Design a protein around this ligand. Structure first.
Ligand SMILES: [Zn+2]
Ligand SMILES: [Zn+2]
Length: 219
């Protein structure tokens, strides 16, 4: 890959995009989203962390001859929603919940072109569903389920196993996070792969691990 963007194949139709940003004292650290390929159409789950990441990702997808039909952003932070303005200009439909758009507007950022106004939403017909579990990392965080591959994109709602803490909790609801996570655990007993917003992909233990971190941060 490059200094800004790496692509990892997760299945025949599913890629992990890993975009890099210098965050001292760590150096270049990564944020994860997905590209979901549905015939000649591609869909973005989260934008890369930097505009240069997003431009390189749009180039990689288009170089396969695919049309980027749409993007869904999984929360209002820059590592999920950062390049809404670039996608809106390129006329790539952006989907965000009413809560995500409220927090983008509160923070003087451009809202999505298209608003999710239900707790569950068919993002790609038969391929990608959005679920709002309640507050955790942020008030607005959503997860995306890929039923064909048994892949759950948890985003920054889910921590990697190695994480000893919840990360940036400035926008978090630590008391609600465990109950929100129980709804995700209860909903996807069939999840084969869980993709956190940062860190290594894993199994459902990442859900239980995040719930435990939240229960401990509360106590
Ligand atoms: Zn975040
Ligand atoms: Zn994040």
């Amino acid at each position: 890959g490059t200094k800004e963007l790496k692509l990892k194949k997760l299945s025949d139709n599913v890629y992990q995009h890993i975009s890099y940003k210098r965050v001292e004292p760590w150096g270049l650290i990564g944020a994860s989203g997905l590209v979901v390929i549905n015939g000649t159409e591609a869909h973005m789950i989260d934008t890369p962390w930097t505009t240069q990441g997003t431009k390189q990702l749009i180039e990689w997808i288009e170089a396969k001859g695919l049309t980027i039909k749409s993007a869904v952003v999984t929360h209002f932070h820059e590592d999920a929603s950062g390049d809404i303005p670039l996608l809106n200009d390129l006329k790539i439909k952006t989907y965000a919940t009413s809560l995500t758009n409220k927090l983008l507007k509160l923070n003087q950022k451009e809202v999505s072109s298209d608003e999710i106004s239900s707790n569950t939403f068919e993002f790609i017909d038969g391929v990608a569903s959005v679920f709002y579990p309640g507050a955790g990392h942020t008030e607005d965080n959503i997860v995306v389920w890929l039923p064909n591959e048994k892949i759950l994109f948890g985003g920054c709602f889910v921590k990697s196993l190695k994480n000893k803490n919840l990360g940036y909790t400035g926008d978090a609801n630590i008391s609600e996070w465990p109950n929100s996570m129980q709804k995700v655990i209860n909903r996807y007993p069939d999840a084969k792969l869980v993709v956190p917003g940062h860190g290594e992909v894993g199994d459902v233990s990442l859900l239980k691990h995040t719930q435990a971190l939240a229960l401990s941060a509360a106590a």
